[PDB]
Amino acid sequence: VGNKNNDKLTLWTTPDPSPNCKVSEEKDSKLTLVLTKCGSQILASVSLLVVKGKFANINNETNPGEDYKKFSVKLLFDANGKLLTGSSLDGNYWNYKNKDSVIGSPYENAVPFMPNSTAYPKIINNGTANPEDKKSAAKKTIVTNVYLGGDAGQPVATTVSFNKETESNCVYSITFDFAWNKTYKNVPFDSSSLTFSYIAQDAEDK
Amino acid sequence: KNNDKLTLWTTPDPSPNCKVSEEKDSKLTLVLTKCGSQILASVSLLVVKGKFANINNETNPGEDYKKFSVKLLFDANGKLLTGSSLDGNYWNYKNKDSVIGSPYENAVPFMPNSTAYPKIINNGTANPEDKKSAAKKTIVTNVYLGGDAGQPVATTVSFNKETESNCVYSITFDFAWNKTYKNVPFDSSSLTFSYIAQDAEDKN
Amino acid sequence: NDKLTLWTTPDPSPNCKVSEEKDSKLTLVLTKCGSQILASVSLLVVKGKFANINNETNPGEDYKKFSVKLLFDANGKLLTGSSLDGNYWNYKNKDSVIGSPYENAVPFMPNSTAYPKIINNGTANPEDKKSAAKKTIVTNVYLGGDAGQPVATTVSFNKETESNCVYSITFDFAWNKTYKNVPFDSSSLTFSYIAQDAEDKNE
Ligand SMILES: N[C@@H](CCC(=O)O)C(=O)O
């Protein structure tokens, strides 16, 4: 209920979260996500440690199926930038920064942290596959690798997508898709930190 | 009014604004955000007509159909020069999802640092201690066509590499691929990068 | 722009030890964007073992990797065991450094909570498990800015204990290719990390 130390320029999970995320089951993972506002862009840092279930100890020798070689983590946001319930991330410690924790009250508005609707539109598809007015599927996308245990020999194909989701009537979204072709033998899903940026939505006029 | 001199951009949803093969054959979305001593940049390229709108290296083998470059040339004041791939009409400081009413006079603080990224590196028989870095002017990475991890494109961002139109600063995007792509539009995933900024003139 | 940048200078003299004293130029710029540091790093080695890599004539594993460490004290000052010399490691003034050594750069240090110095999980319950990998960024830089000359690059935060350091930034470089007369001249790498907060002043 009010502090001098709360910065509305950082929206985060806290830097050292308790289990806060669903990969396979409730609270089976720690998502560390920091969104820092640098004006027109968000500067983001993401790492995922899964602490129990299917992906806490990957073994594709003993679990060869394709459902054991990929998963997705979704953040769904409403018109005001609030986290919606169908999200992978629990909202309890998803809030503006105060020291190494969150502000006293849940945030009302985080639109300026949302991926820009104009740059990253949710998309309409009829007929005209190309009148040369065609809009970019890929632009909403960052494609890279993270590395399990910070080992360069354990890559995981990582796709960050902006405003790709429609679930729970969301207006904005950030999706992390992880997938690997290597057949990993007893490798915890513990991802190296990934820096990325996206163009920010502006605050509403009045 | 709402005009933000901490962002220099193409607008987030540009009309065709770029030449890859021919005039206005592509949409370059480039956002430069000033974070003091560094520029934070996001770039994506959609080509909407010509050679690279639908890559088919089965029907177009050989290497002029497997690479191209996009150049931004800047003068002493950071203004976009005419030989640039990018058209300057909607290259300007931000105003609420568009550009400011008038063309900018100065964007030096957005330019790649001359000291960090000197125009000409040629280390002679110079002493080791005096040697300058060719690679430092360079970022080497991949973007992915259609946001598909199986469609990589070797991407080099180069700073102050260009001499064209007697430019003092430049940003170059070189794209190339070895995969023989069958009907893949050049529609690149977004690339985040940073570079060291030139200081403002005089009393900075 | 000035107390918000901690750097090597953009065009440094030899300032770094890879094999021997002042055998390399580390360009490191740390820019404060509030809760995160925005970083650019590039390494040119100008003499010794790694100035002209030849793994045909020097096949051993000690010729195919090396590490560059920055060790920091409680106040964020560079400690002497560091690879980087502290003479031109300071807050920015134009394309150079301030007249006097800095007293405090805690707000540039990698967050202790996000990147704990010792965090090992013998007799830890799942919920209490701490991440080795989170302290890590793993990527490639490219020698000469050539896409055919990759170097596996790991940036690690608060991994070092040397000289009783409180914070650290480590650059590990390694390659499997057998390079024949390739100077170690790395392409620039952008990265960010979560920043330590300034300590509470007047309570
Ligand atoms: N270097 C500028 C900075 C302007 C400011 O910080 O307001 C000046 O003092 O002229």
Residue numbers in the entry:
A (entry chain C): 178 to 383
B (entry chain A): 181 to 384
C (entry chain B): 183 to 385
Q: From the publication, what sentences describe this entry?
A:
We performed X-ray crystallography to generate structures of species D human adenovirus fiber knob proteins HAdV-D15, D24, D29, D30, D32 and D53 in their apo states. These structures show the expected trimeric form, all viewed down towards the apical domain of the fiber knob proteins ([Fig fig1]). HAdV-D15, D24 and D32 were crystallised in only their apo states, whereas HAdV-D25, D29, D30 and D53 crystals were also soaked with sialic acid. The observed space groups were monoclinic (P2_1_ P2 or C2), orthorhombic (P2_1_2_1_2_1_), trigonal (H3 – R3 in hexagonal axes) or cubic (P23). However, there were varying numbers of monomers or trimers in each asymmetric unit, presenting a diverse picture of the fiber knob interactions. In this article we present seven novel structures of apo state fiber-knob proteins of species D adenoviruses ([Fig fig1]). These provide a good basis from which to conduct structural analyses.
Species D (HAdV-D) are the most diverse species and cause both gastrointestinal tract infections and epidemic keratoconjunctivitis (EKC). Each protein forms key interactions to promote cell infection, with the terminal domain of the fiber, the fiber knob protein, interacting with the viruses’ primary cell entry receptor. The adenovirus fiber knob protein is known to have a highly conserved trimeric structure. Sialic acid (SA) usage has been proposed as a major mechanism of cell infection for EKC causing HAdV-D. Here, we provide apo state crystal structures for fiber knob proteins of 7 previously undetermined HAdV-D, and provide crystal structures of HAdV-D25, HAdV-D29 and HAdV-D53 knob proteins bound to SA.
